[PDB]
Amino acid sequence: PTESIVRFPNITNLCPFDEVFNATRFASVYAWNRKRISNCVADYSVLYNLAPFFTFKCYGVSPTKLNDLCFTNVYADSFVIRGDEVRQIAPGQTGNIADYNYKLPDDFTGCVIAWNSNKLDSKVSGNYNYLYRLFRKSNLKPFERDISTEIYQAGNKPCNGVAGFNCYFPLRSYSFRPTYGVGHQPYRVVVLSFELLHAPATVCGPKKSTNLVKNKCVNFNFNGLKGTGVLTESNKKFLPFQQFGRDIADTTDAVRDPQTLEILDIT
């Protein structure tokens, strides 16, 4: 009568999204940390169920199909960005952040996640713990980070690191206070990057199971194998690290699920 869903194995190791989204200190805007996430299962539904984010604009992907399709590797970049600059994260945007701090290609896959962080990253006075690049002689290349401590120069004469006229420090400090406006509030933004290569993927996502049905002619689906029969135990003790059995006429006669490791005769 009904349909039994696929009995994929137990929940394996989870991707470290807890420490990414709840770290006690985030990296600077110019010195943004680069982290690679792989060899786990990705679950974006649990983060979306709480819904603490005010930005969900994504191009090329959909939240419903995130659990179906998957890529080779996941890259995470976490750094504090105010909402004005946040609205500027789109690839079709220009400015100081989009051309001197971070760059996104036109064919970028994925999007970023931003949420309000007015409580954290602030004190009674102005917080000067975060800096950003302001002056550059050329457009920033996509997907790369440059950390230069040299004194930026604008005048014809060169200055040897002094703080004189026509040349100053390119980096500038932030001012985070609780009395600032909504648009000047400091938000915590994490970049979710997706890259697809010719190599097989290593992180896609987990899956659930259903209730057992016995002594009934109910169609099944075990590890992507479709068939009809009655699920009943037997005495066919088999060797481990196998998926399913067969017969002379290629018809499946036994399959084990990675939950109880039973016989589960097909017909």
């Epitope: 105010r82 004005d84 600059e85 500027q88 220009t94 400015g95 100081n96 952040i97 051309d99 001197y100 102005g126 302001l134 002056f135 550059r136 002689k137 050329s138 457009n139 120069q153 604008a154 005048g155 014809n156 026509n166 100053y168 500038r172 001012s175 206070r177 009395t179 600032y180 406006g181 909504v182 648009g183 000047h184």
Partner: antibody
């Protein structure tokens, strides 16, 4: 040691075009932020355009269209492109250089008038 | 988006007085304000930046302070040459400059 020379202003028809030149002596137009200001008579200042150190151009809400900036490194002079004018577009302007959120350099002023 | 208004319009004071020029902010912007002075028929000049620091060429008679929403331009000593309009300037994240009204300072006659 900083000086800015302005030229090209004058009386032109509203349905015409004008050439704006902003010359920098001790400054390079392709290495720092560029600022443009406007001031109609009888009132205060206003902002029309800002040119970045790269290929980024921004304009105000009233002037999103009909305005284009283009810098050249041949003679370190800035050129402004204009095709359309309004009745209130006549004002005084001072092309200038400055850092973020504040500017210190300033230039001279050439009057422009539009009438039929 | 952002609109800036100046409460004083025309204040009359002598040499031994404080102009008490203030700029009203609708939103919360602190320590990111600059004041500019222009003469009639002359180019404007910068006076202070970030509402706390003082320029090297500007004499230290000009003073300014403001935490989150209100700023002041109190001057220790007023000179006959230093009689001009003052404007409060606030920038945006895309370096969108905004200029409001001006206040002219004169002497009670």
């Amino acid at each position: 040691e900083v000086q800015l020379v302005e030229s090209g202003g004058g009386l032109i028809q509203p349905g015409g075009s004008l050439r704006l030149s902003c010359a920098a002596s001790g400054l390079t137009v392709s290495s720092n932020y560029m600022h443009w200001v406007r001031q109609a008579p009888g009132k205060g200042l206003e902002w029309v355009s800002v040119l970045y150190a790269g290929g980024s151009a921004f304009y105000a809400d009233s002037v999103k269209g009909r305005f284009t900036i283009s810098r050249n490194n041949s003679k370190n002079t800035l050129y402004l492109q204009m095709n359309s004018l309004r009745a209130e577009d006549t004002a005084i302007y001072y092309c200038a250089r400055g850092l973020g959120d504040y500017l210190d350099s300033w230039g001279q002023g050439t009057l422009v008038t539009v009438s039929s | 988006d952002i609109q800036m208004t100046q409460s004083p319009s025309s204040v009359s004071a002598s040499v031994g007085d404080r102009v008490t020029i203030t700029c009203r902010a609708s939103q919360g912007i602190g320590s990111w304000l600059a004041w500019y002075q222009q003469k009639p028929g002359k180019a404007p000049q910068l006076l202070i930046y970030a509402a706390s620091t003082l320029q090297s060429g500007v004499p230290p008679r000009f003073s300014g302070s403001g935490s989150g929403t209100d700023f002041t331009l109190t001057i220790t000593s007023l000179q006959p040459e230093d009689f001009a309009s003052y404007y409060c300037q606030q920038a945006n994240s895309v370096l969108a400059l905004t200029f409001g009204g001006g206040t002219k300072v004169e002497i009670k006659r």
